[PDB]
Structures are given as C-alpha cells and as structure tokens.
Write a protein that binds this ligand. Structure first.
Ligand SMILES: CCCC[C@H](CC)CO
Ligand SMILES: [Cl-]
Length: 152
C-alpha cells in the first residue's frame, strides 16, 4: 500500500457489520465518506450522516498505531482499522474493529471514487465480508439509501 494515493474524494458504497444495528438507519456507524486526507501520522476523514432526517457533518482523524498499516480513532468507543484492498483510483475496502464496554464488532466498508461501483467489485466485497464472518444479510448497499449526496 502506497497510502498517499488514497487521498481525496470518496463515496460510501457498501457498509457491513457483524452487529447490524450499528449500520442501520439510526446506527452510529451509518456515515457517508466525503474525503480522506493523508497526513504524515494520520488519516483525516470527513463524513456526512443523517440525524433525525437531516444531514450533518462528522470529522475524524485516525492516528497510526504501533502496528504497521493500522490506524486508531475514538468514535463510539475505540476503533482500529486497516485497508484490505484498493486500486487507488476506483475502490478501497476498509476493515475496522470497534471496542466498547468489553465487547467488539467488525465493520467493513467499500468506498468508490464515484457514487457507484460495478457489480463485480461489489460481489468481491461481499465475499470478503463473508470471509470475516459478516453474512450477506448484514451488508447494506448505501446507493439505495440516503447518503446525503446533496450535502457534499
Ligand atoms: C475507515 C472506516 C471509518 C468508519 C466509520 C467511522 C469510524 C464508521 O462507519
Ligand atoms: Cl443521497
């Protein structure tokens, strides 16, 4: 991974979790990326989210941890994440682990440089989710939901 090449604008495409409530319409992890800025020691994200039907912004900065490739950020508990796969100019796949209260769950996210991605890429993501114990019923195609695109 050449992390500098993930800089710039992205769209949230598929969102998946082994704790489905977290990514349902009112879940804390139901956020829609707008950009990722690469800094020397971190990744700075801008997201939108819907709160009571209205779009709103969320900004997070994730710091490099002591494990190469891994980043951490506080948001609804303590999160660590890695980049699973990317071609830089079309798709990126993230894997995240949340811890809160002694409990954990996984999130996986597929982002695109455009507002949609083709079915081949989506199906490959779905298979990768399954490989992490995230079942097909726990993968949401955000392109058929409110992603706050009008707010970008
Ligand atoms: C890299 C994943 C960012 C995930 C996000 C904020 C922690 C929630 O969907
Ligand atoms: Cl939308």
């Amino acid at each position: 991974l050449n992390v500098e090449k993930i800089n710039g604008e992205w769209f949230s495409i598929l969102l998946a979790s082994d704790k489905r409530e977290k990514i349902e319409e009112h879940g804390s992890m139901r956020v829609f990326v707008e950009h990722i800025h690469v800094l020397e020691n971190s990744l700075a994200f801008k997201f939108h989210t819907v709160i009571d039907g209205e779009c709103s912004e969320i900004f997070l900065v994730a710091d490099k941890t002591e494990k190469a490739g891994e980043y951490s950020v506080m948001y609804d508990g303590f999160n660590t994440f890695t980049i699973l796969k990317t071609d830089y100019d079309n798709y990126i796949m993230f894997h995240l682990i949340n811890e809160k209260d002694g409990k954990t769950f996984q999130l996986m996210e597929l982002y695109g440089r455009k507002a949609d991605l083709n079915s081949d890429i989506k199906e490959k993501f779905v298979k990768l989710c399954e490989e992490h114990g995230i079942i097909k019923e726990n993968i949401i195609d955000l392109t058929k939901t409110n992603r706050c695109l009008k707010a970008r």
